Amino acid sequence: VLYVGSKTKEGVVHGVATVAEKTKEQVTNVGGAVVTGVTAVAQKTVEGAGSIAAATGFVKK
Amino acid sequence: VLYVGSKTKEGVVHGVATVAEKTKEQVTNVGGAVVTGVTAVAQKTVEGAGSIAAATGFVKK
Amino acid sequence: VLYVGSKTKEGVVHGVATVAEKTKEQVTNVGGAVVTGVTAVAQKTVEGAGSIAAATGFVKK
Amino acid sequence: VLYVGSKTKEGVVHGVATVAEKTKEQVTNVGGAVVTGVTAVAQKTVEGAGSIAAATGFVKK
Amino acid sequence: VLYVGSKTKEGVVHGVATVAEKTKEQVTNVGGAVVTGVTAVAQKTVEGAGSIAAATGFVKK
Amino acid sequence: VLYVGSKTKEGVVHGVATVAEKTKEQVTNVGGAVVTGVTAVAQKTVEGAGSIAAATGFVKK
Numbered sequence A, B, C, D, E, F: 001v002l003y004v005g006s007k008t009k010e011g012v013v014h015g016v017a018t019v020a021e022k023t024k025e026q027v028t029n030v031g032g033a034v035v036t037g038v039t040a041v042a043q044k045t046v047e048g049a050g051s052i053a054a055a056t057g058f059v060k061k
């Protein structure tokens, strides 16, 4: 019945330095799922499911 | 009945330095799932499931 | 009935330095799951399951 | 009498990632020299002296 | 009388990752020399002297 | 009378990862020399003297 927050961080990404030197980068997909290259990602979910870099093949029913 | 937070971090990523020198990077997918390259990712889930880099093959019913 | 936090860290990643020099990096998937390359990842889940780099083959019913 | 170069690097800096989180940074100088904070610096000198981060006190004659 | 170079590196710095978390950083100089914080520095000198992070007190004549 | 180089490295620094967590860092100089904090430094000198992190007190004549 009382929430007191002060400088409360939750799901926070800060101070990132990235260097990516590459000569080739191919991705060949045939009927599935490919996730690639997620970086410096932050989220907060209340009352629900939270997926960041989620690959699902296929759902057949 | 009383929550007092002060500089409370939860699911926090900070101060990351990354260098990735590569000459080739291929990914060949055929009908499944591929997750690759997740970095400096932070999240917080309340009342739910949280997956960061989750690959699922296929769900057949 | 009383929660007092002060500089309470939970699921925190900080101060990471990474260098990855590679000449080739292939991944060939055929109908399964492949997770690769998770780094500096932090999360917190309340009232739910939390998987970071989870690969599942396939769920047949 | 014949110079053949090919992809010849000399005094080269590449692919640097830096993160510097600091709360205070003071420098107090009284009549001398202070050099601070040189990063990712490259040079090439022909027929002469080359100093990168050089502090000299004082030259009295 | 014949110089053949191919992918010849000389004084080269590459692929550096640095993280420096500090709370305080003071430097107090009184009439001398202070050099601090040189990182990822590369040079090449021909026919001359080369100093990278050189501190000299004072030259009295 | 014939120099054939191929992938010849000389004075090369690569693939360095550094983390430096410090709470305080003071340097107090009075009329001398202080060198501190040299990292991932590379050079090549031809026909001359080369000093990397050299501190000299004072030269009186």
Ligand SMILES: COc1ccc2nc(/C=C/c3cnc(N(C)C)s3)oc2c1
Binding pocket: A003, A004, A005, A006, A008, B003, B005, B008, C046
């Ligand atoms: C025992 O049951 C549990 C389990 C996990 C929990 N995690 C929390 C976080 C609560 C807060 C975070 N920031 C708040 N502000 C700034 C108002 S409140 O509470 C939990 C209770």
Ligand SMILES: COc1ccc2nc(/C=C/c3cnc(N(C)C)s3)oc2c1
Binding pocket: D003, D004, D005, D006, D008, E003, E005, E008, F046
């Ligand atoms: C024995 O005397 C010495 C000593 C050190 C030397 N360092 C060299 C470098 C020569 C070159 C570098 N890149 C060149 N291209 C691409 C034309 S030529 O020659 C030296 C001779």
